[PDB]
Design a protein around this ligand. Structure first.
Ligand code: 2TM
Ligand code: MN
Ligand code: MN
Length: 342
DNA sequence: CTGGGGTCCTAGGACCC
DNA sequence: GGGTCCTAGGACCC
């Protein structure tokens, strides 16, 4: 049919929760990210900091080259987690059809709700307001007939605002929309479809689908469907965690197995505790390890295995350390585990 | 000067048709 | 010629 979707997105989420519990940071540049001593990167940044040009996923070295007086915080999870619990409860009051994406996001299908006389625009306005009133944080909304447009619109108005796209607005909206804003079209593909001349949807709309399944396979279909603004994906509230990882990047590389083993001794207890919260008996499907060398190439060894076992990890890492390092430094060691199927 | 937590997609070989 | 599991890797998102 024609549904009503509401992408809610907390505005620079982890930064906002810091500014509220510490109003001193309200107007001075702040970021959450690992310190440059540790080779970290920026998670999020307040608006005083984005002035300078600091964005998420930026190396901390560069965040300070463009904003020296940047206050760097490590980050507090629950403070973000507890806040993200509340917003989800607030969604619960309006629908049960809630697809949580990350901590600050949520797709909401409201097609079958009469909370605000069946107007998605108010329901969105309500959640944004009632989140503000009880958590003292601001949120932003995107209303659309489908999932990906509701998300694009949530960044449309950006800070403490919303943006609505009706089916009559859609065909014009997609003429000028660049492929890179379509969630799932990141840097590499954006660069590639453009080597073929395709920068906006409207360029793809005049293209052939037979060939787009040649050059891109399945991804060419998804591209083609939304360059057409078709998106059948349903708001699923049932998705579960499939895997639990713990990984670490160290200040200066390591070159000897004894060091790598010393790291594994310390990340295993965290992986145990984390997996305990979900499987108190530790039964799993596969476990494995992950190295990242200095040439940034990354390798994985993982094999079917019944229960989180410390000694098999050290074993498997050691074997990977031997036959795949080629005597390069390694900047990252990590442990992984794939959950059982239920 | 490049995190840490994840998701989904691809592809070859193995296994069992 | 199948499906499906197993494994490794890559693009992508917050
Ligand atoms: N690469 C990344 C990107 C995001 N994050 C995490 O994602 C959160 C919100 O996502 P987000 O993408 O919405 C950013 P937000 O802070 O909310 O800015 P906005 O107001 O424009 O939406 C941040 O608070 C970070 O912890 C990360 O850890 N690594
Ligand atoms: Mn956000
Ligand atoms: Mn978000």
């Amino acid at each position: 049919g024609s549904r009503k979707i509401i992408h809610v997105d907390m505005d620079c989420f982890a930064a906002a929760v810091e500014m509220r519990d510490n109003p001193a940071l309200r107007d001075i540049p702040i970021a959450i990210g690992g310190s440059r001593e540790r080779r970290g990167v920026i998670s999020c940044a307040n608006y005083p900091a984005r002035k300078f040009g600091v964005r998420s996923a930026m190396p901390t070295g560069m965040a300070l080259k463009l904003c020296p007086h940047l206050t760097l915080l490590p980050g507090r999870f629950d403070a973000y987690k507890e806040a993200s619990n509340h917003i989800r409860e607030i969604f619960s009051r309006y629908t049960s059809r809630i697809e949580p994406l990350s901590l600050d996001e949520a797709y909401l299908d409201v097609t079958d709700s009469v909370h605000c006389h069946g107007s998605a625009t108010l329901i969105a306005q309500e959640i944004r307001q009632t989140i503000f009133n009880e958590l003292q944080l601001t949120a932003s909304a995107g209303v659309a007939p489908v999932k990906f447009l509701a998300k694009i619109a949530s960044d449309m108005n950006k800070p403490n605002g919303q943006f609505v796209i009706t089916p009559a607005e859609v065909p014009a909206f997609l003429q000028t929309l660049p492929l890179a804003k379509i969630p799932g079209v990141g840097k590499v593909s954006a660069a590639k479809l453009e080597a073929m001349g395709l920068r906006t949807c409207g360029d793809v709309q005049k293209c052939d689908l037979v060939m787009l399944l040649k050059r891109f396979g399945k991804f060419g279909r998804i591209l083609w469907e939304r360059s057409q603004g078709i998106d059948e994906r349903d708001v699923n509230s049932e998705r579960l965690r499939k895997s639990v990882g713990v990984e670490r990047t160290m200040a200066e590389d390591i070159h000897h197995w004894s060091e790598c083993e010393a790291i594994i001794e310390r990340l295993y207890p965290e992986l145990e505790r984390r997996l305990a919260k979900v499987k108190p008996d530790l039964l799993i499907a596969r476990q494995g390890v992950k190295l990242k060398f200095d040439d940034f190439q990354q390798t994985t060894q993982e094999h079917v295995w019944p229960r989180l076992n410390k000694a098999d990890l050290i074993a498997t890492a050691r074997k990977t350390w031997d036959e795949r390092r080629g005597g390069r430094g390694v900047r990252l060691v990590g442990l992984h585990v794939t959950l059982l199927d239920p």
